[PDB]
Design an enzyme around this catalytic site. Structure first.
Site: not given
Lengths: 266, 266, 266, 266, 266, 266
Positions: D71-72, D136, D165
């Site tokens: 997740l980083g 991104y 989301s």
């Protein structure tokens, strides 16, 4: 000769005038028809002036004909009532007349304007959903849908030819893709009429252009391979015309400037 | 309430009478319109009796409305003259009236009859080529094509709902596939009007039937999921109606008995 | 000419040296750039020594150019550090510089190595998922994705040319499929800069080889048709090289021996 | 358990803090890592402070782990320098570390932003061409392409989870389509680690939303079916937020307002 | 020469006799086999007369051969018993013999009759479901399926050539689509044997006919481009044979008159 | 009851024993047949022991039957001669018998082994090319091809059911995808026989498993929706069986361990 009598409607228009000459070898008698005044019948010709919206007239026009090349009606964007008469009521009358007279095979002049809102960058097969660019385009869709119904219900055969730019020579950037030479349209018509089985195929009306947008591969069974190529004209077009503006509908939409048309009022 | 005023055309017909009741909660005022006589307006209702072929009347009918559920016109196979007035001229008039009055979003009653000649064994997505099963089907194709053009040209949004069989319950073998419950049509209409962005999508008008023929998956963005299922009625239909002959249009073509219709004449 | 000033990056490399000569006719001024020393500027030339990782130098390199042929960066599999500088940081700097200086149209040297892991037996269209065969391939995918983003966000136009084997002639079995002649690359570049509208298309960079693996049909709108054919060299290859082993990556994977590369370390 | 040691990177962030709690049952030891300070390790926990751009630190972070939930890195649109370190250099370091330590299976947090420029009306399968909505998104495409290369080259398995989301509940109109509940993400992670064979599949990270845009049907082999449904929150959204403007990117593009981001500068 | 010894089965039949001559240059020794009598072996030839149903004989026939062109068996619709021996048992024996003798690459004479019930209007790619037009067609499907299994299980490579009409010239309307010239079959065989990697591809056996029904584009990797064109014979056929009735199988089904065959009994 | 007499072949096998009981309600008389000894006929039963390769016996077996569920023949990989008799000659005999006795509708037990070499990660529609995993799989392809020919030529209707794992309960990892419950097979058979029009559809024989690999959506017209779901057993399977090795054919190929079968010799 392919047949005893061939009907060509829209015979007074520029393309009809070309066909009146080029198609003569296909039949013993060519019957020419239009709403507009026709040059008088010469040898081996019959000429009929009539209103496609007059059902009785269309019946008489079709009677005795073994095939029809239907170029008649309204050929550009116009107010609704003109298009209704020539291209909608007119088409119903044409199909009923054919149904009453032995279902002569039909070459229908459909149009690229049935798909005019597609971007020029998108390659299209024959089954793409319609995106008509005006009332004229919608009316040509009507002709296609009506023809398909008569095919399914009665067996009436029609070639639905979505004409690109059938002119003598390409003369702008868009025509490098849309050009349909006289020679290639004539050979298409010959191939349509010679086929033992036709069905109701969509046919993209363009020559073998390097920059063509449309895929006719599924029409292979007809044995029609266009021989002309608009690319031969690119240099010439560059040398004799101003560069298009990238923002012009001419180089953005397959229907070209028709997308810029409003709804015309009478 | 979804809006101030919702127009429902074809309000005197069987489906129209249902929607007159069921759609009341969606707007402060429901305006009902039909060619034929309407029960008098109650509180929260307005009624107008007019012919879709008459442009001035259609303009008045549309003006002030925030949305339109268009059920009006000819609803079965009829002679061309009637179809022309109600479904061709009438459609042009409706779209022009909308364009002149803020482009209220439209739910258009198209029909399975636009694809009536497909075999019942073939599963259809929204992009399949039309195979209309008569003049009525061709006229609904015209509405779809016209609506698409107004969308691409002006941004007018329309849900093209290809209605199956919207009746109180399924009552024959074909309706095990085509049934569209009142509840599911109402919820579809709710989903259409609530969407920030609609576009001009084809929508298959059927409940969540085990024997359904049609694929609405690409409409996912709308968030509409029908809840009723014709399959619940199979036993009843089997035990209360005659078994279909395998050669019957009813079990061969998606349009059912419409394929057997002739061209009706006036 | 086609423009006032054309930039060619990677101009010291083998292909860059070819383009320095072949593209001269396309511009009044040819600007050549590379990390490595260049032969001095002749008449109608400008020469620039630039590290693509240096944003200021890249800005100055691009300023004043009406078009860019981007060949520079790392051209084979190498350690991550080098690829990062030349093909990742370098690409960001190039796109930012273009964005700041009028968005000159870009021909990007992507690579077959973006799809190197596909079997040679599979025919590929432009939309296939990437299967890069090492860090070099991954970095070319980065260039493609970054270019697409600048197109959607700012309208920057780029031809993403997935180069096969651009050499003087085919010299092994794989090149019978991948060969991209100098002439055909030059005409592609001419076609890219002449197009009124380009977009951000994937272009398969190969000549018209009988044994080609790639489908450029959806690029039809561009009007570019390569003319050379590696097939003419099949006998010459058989008479100058050992026959391939069927287990060799050279004849199993589209990326050839790149799939056999480990991750190289500095 | 499912394994001896599970690594969760980005464990200081909002989603990481959720996973620190929810994934504890999956391993005897949970190793949490982040660039930012972490709450101290409790029983059955290890906490690591690591810059993903530091290859040695990353090697040590991964050593001894049987699985990784990555997740980083950078989680929103930011300047290139930051994205380069966290999501490009960082990803290379992560994959090299895995390759050196037994190739622990990886759940990669990709993003809907890899396809952010698609219209919300278009339903997407896993093979669609990327249309990233900023740097991104481009960096998440890089992660996907790099992961695919390590899979083809070394057999490293990764689930490429394009997160919608992932929040406690839907809180705007777009989330009626993109919401990915905590429960459904947890069960996906469980399914990914339990599979005998995974490969390198694209997984659309969303709950079972009525208004979902994405098609996970080809992932059937995994046996993962999300159970939550954002549709349950539609009324709540209407009663807590202003209605969306149809011109808002929030309801026009799959990436929502990310398409409106410029290139941010440091 | 492509190899030391090439086996040609069915060598006594019309096509076999042609290949006995035309394939001589491909191998040092041509071994000819047939159930029926063969003209005596010349220099560079070996001849064996055997029944494909006899495993020992098939083993001897295959042993020592580097490649096989399998034309043998039953070549038209016949009673099941005959087909079973020559095309089912015989095929199993051939594949087992190959497996026991170094898996020499096989060119298998499949047939258009595997897809004989498709309409002539439908263009077919290699992956279409079979629609065999009799027991002969079903038996060629069996050969294709068996060959595929031996490929997936053992790596045996086979070209599944669905032969159209391989005759000296086209002599009816159907052959304008199905003609496969001797020259083009010979060049295909050359391309099959020279390929480092073949796999088990379906190949449509036709020349480059304008009226062709079949798509070989995905076979591009082989580099085979037929050069002959049946279209050249259309005029001759028209002027020397009776026009087909549109209801004739000859112009309705791809398998032509085979669809009209009954099940023949012994 | 659906019919006067229903034939079930393979009635002595495990699945046939289940059908002998479950299908009794569908007909006044159930005729059971097998080569292996059958438990004696009870009330409302007839029992026939016969060799499918004996044409006369199969004729008598079929005579007087209004429908057939064909489970008989060889059901696993065996030497060629056994499969030839039971599944190839046997199938020809069955179809000829049906043709001579009013063409009773057939449910054919095809098999997943027709497509056994596909990876378990690949989702399959009904038109995928066959990849049979042994002689048994090839023989089931033969049955499918033969049935299609009889459908096209004579109108004989058959449901081609590619059975997954029709067992009482899933008991390994592969069955989480392939399981076909007794209840769901029985309801499929009921739906097949009740349909006014069937055709010759491919049907994937599996329940509504979350991990299913196959797409039955095109079969919608039948109104059959399986109700069981193997996923209910995942926990149970994990708790009662050893984890599969990722290298096992059981979790790599759709045909499971059949891909590991050699060609068995008698």
């Amino acid at each position: 000769m392919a047949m005893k009598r061939l009907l060509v409607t829209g015979a007074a228009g520029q393309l009809g005038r070309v066909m009146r000459e080029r198609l003569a070898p296909m039949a013993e008698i060519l019957r020419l028809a239009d709403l507009s005044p026709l040059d008088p019948a010469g040898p081996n010709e019959e000429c009929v002036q009539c209103d496609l919206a007059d059902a009785n007239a269309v019946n008489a026009m079709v009677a005795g004909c073994d095939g029809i090349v239907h170029l008649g009606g309204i050929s550009v964007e116009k107010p609704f009532e003109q298009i209704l008469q020539g291209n909608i009521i007119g088409l119903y009358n044409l199909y009923e007349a054919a149904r009453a007279h032995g279902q002569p095979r039909i070459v229908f002049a459909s149009s690229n304007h049935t798909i005019g809102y597609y971007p020029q960058t998108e390659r299209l097969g024959p089954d793409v959903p319609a995106r008509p660019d005006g009332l004229y385009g919608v009316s040509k869709c009507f002709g296609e849908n009506l023809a398909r119904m008569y095919f399914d219900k009665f067996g009436q055969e029609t070639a639905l030819v979505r004409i690109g730019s059938c002119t003598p020579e390409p003369n702008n950037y868009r025509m490098l893709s849309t050009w349909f030479s006289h020679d290639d349209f004539v050979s298409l018509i010959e191939a349509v009429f010679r086929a033992p089985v036709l069905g109701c195929p969509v046919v993209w009306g363009a020559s073998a252009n390097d920059a063509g947008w449309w895929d006719n591969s599924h029409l292979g069974f007809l044995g029609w391979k266009p021989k002309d190529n608009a690319e031969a004209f690119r240099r010439h077009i560059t040398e004799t015309t101003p560069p298009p503006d990238p923002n012009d509908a001419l180089v953005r939409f397959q229907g070209g400037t028709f997308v810029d048309n409003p709804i015309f009022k009478q």
